Design an enzyme around this catalytic site. Structure first.
Site, short mmCIF file in Angstrom:
data_model
loop_
_atom_site.label_atom_id
_atom_site.label_comp_id
_atom_site.label_asym_id
_atom_site.label_seq_id
_atom_site.Cartn_x
_atom_site.Cartn_y
_atom_site.Cartn_z
N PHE A 107 4.85 -6.23 19.77
CA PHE A 107 4.61 -7.64 20.06
C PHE A 107 5.90 -8.28 20.52
CE2 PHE A 107 1.56 -6.65 16.51
CZ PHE A 107 0.43 -6.60 17.32
N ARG A 137 -8.26 -9.65 10.98
CA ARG A 137 -8.54 -8.34 11.57
C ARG A 137 -8.87 -8.42 13.06
NH1 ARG A 137 -8.67 -4.16 8.92
NH2 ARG A 137 -10.14 -3.05 10.29
N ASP A 189 -7.69 2.63 7.84
CA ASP A 189 -8.15 1.51 8.67
C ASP A 189 -8.54 2.07 10.03
OD1 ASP A 189 -6.85 -1.85 9.20
OD2 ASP A 189 -8.32 -0.74 10.38
N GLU A 212 0.81 -1.21 0.00
CA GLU A 212 0.00 0.00 0.00
C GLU A 212 0.85 1.26 0.00
OE1 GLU A 212 -1.04 -0.48 4.83
OE2 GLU A 212 -2.62 -0.29 3.32
#
Ligand SMILES: O=c1ccn([C@@H]2O[C@H](COP(=O)(O)OP(=O)(O)O)[C@@H](O)[C@H]2O)c(=O)[nH]1
Ligand SMILES: [Mn+2]
Length: 351
Positions: free
Chosen positions: A72, A191, A100, A22
């Site tokens: 993470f 998602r 988003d 993107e």
């Protein structure tokens, strides 16, 4: 005029990952509308310059592609840290592309300060003080505003259909008739379960030949509120620039979204599907005013209606081709407004 575009939390290299893809597509569409733009990422590459080889103040505009800033595991994610350090050094206004709803702009410092590796960064190095203008893909702006309540530097909110870039690329073309091997197809990630109810409703226990491609996996669907017996076939991820080809393998492709996308966001998948050889079938709740296409045959309310609509398409090749002709014509009407779209983008980044 020199423009810099960066992804706030993902490395940018090629088309193997969605965030990288993107960012490169955005870089390309901006370059195609008459502008000197560079992508700044971790290292120098085919499409990028390195954070450590450039001076952020050599740029007149700084565009940032939204991303999560969650750390993470127990390690310093350089993609996040280097981007925020770069942003923190910038003096002017930052343009945040909000595509988003789960990725609103936020400071990484609050998190970093409590990590075991906090000694590696100072508050000054990471705290972003420049004013921020959120360019939202949502036309109502209500979700964007609510999502950025815990931020003070965000002084502006403006709507712009960012993801229309798919159809405005200089190399874009509609998909050609493709040999069918699937009834219904849908590509995407899990998602974080934010769309589990919709995914189970339209893609599970249908009795049809359905494929679910993308990062999502069958074992992730375990919410007791949305039970199922027969799951679609999960085939794994593919490059973003191969998505329309994949969609074209099916008679129909599904369009669904997170609750907050409803009657607000017209996402990239709408264009990737509309441009494909698959008939676009849209969840009624996603677009209740039928803004995408003024033909109710492209909308379905639930599992039963989806099954029936697909059965109609399998029964009549004439109907299928008629609907494909209509959706392709509608796509062309939006492509005819390319110049207006480009000018609107320039206005959004104050040019
Ligand atoms: O294997 C895959 C599946 C999906 N995508 C891309 O991922 C997007 C979907 O992202 P997401 O799952 O977040 O869904 P959205 O919320 O955008 O509908 C699609 O439009 C594609 O461009 C991709 O590149 N490869
Ligand atoms: Mn998306």
């Amino acid at each position: 005029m020199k423009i810099a575009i960066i992804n706030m939390g993902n490395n940018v290299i090629n088309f193997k990952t969605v965030p990288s893809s993107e960012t490169i597509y955005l870089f390309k569409v901006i370059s195609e509308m008459g502008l000197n733009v560079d992508i700044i990422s971790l290292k120098n590459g085919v499409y990028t310059k390195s954070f450590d080889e450039v001076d952020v103040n050599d740029y007149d505009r700084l565009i940032v592609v939204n991303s999560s800033i969650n750390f993470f595991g127990g390690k310093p994610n350089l993609a996040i840290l280097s981007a925020q350090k770069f942003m923190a050094k910038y003096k002017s206004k930052i343009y945040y592309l909000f595509t988003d709803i789960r990725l609103p702009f936020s400071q990484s410092w609050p998190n970093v300060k409590n990590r075991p590796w906090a000694y590696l960064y100072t508050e000054e190095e990471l705290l972003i003080k420049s004013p921020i203008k959120v360019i939202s893909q949502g036309i109502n702006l209500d979700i964007a505003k609510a999502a950025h309540k815990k931020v003070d530097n965000v002084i502006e909110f403006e709507y712009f259909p960012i993801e229309q870039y798919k159809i405005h690329m200089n190399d874009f073309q509609l998909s050609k008739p493709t040999k069918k091997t699937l009834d219904v197809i849908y590509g995407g990630s899990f998602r974080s379960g934010q769309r589990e109810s919709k995914m189970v409703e339209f893609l599970f226990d249908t009795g049809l030949n359905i494929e679910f491609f993308g990062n999502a996996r069958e074992k992730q669907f375990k919410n007791p509120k949305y039970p199922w017996t027969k799951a679609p076939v999960f085939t794994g991820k593919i490059p973003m620039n191969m998505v329309s080809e994949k969609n074209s393998q099916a008679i129909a492709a599904l369009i669904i979204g997170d609750k907050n996308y409803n009657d607000n966001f017209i996402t990239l998948r709408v264009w990737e599907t509309m441009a494909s050889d698959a008939v676009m079938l849209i969840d009624e709740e996603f677009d209740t005013k039928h803004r995408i296409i003024n033909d109710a045959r492209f909308y379905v309310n639930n599992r039963a209606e989806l099954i029936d609509r697909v059965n109609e398409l399998k029964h009549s090749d004439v109907l299928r081709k008629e609907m494909l002709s209509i959706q392709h014509d509608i796509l062309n009407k939006t492509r005819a407004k390319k110049a207006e779209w480009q000018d609107a983008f320039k206005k959004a980044i104050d040019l």
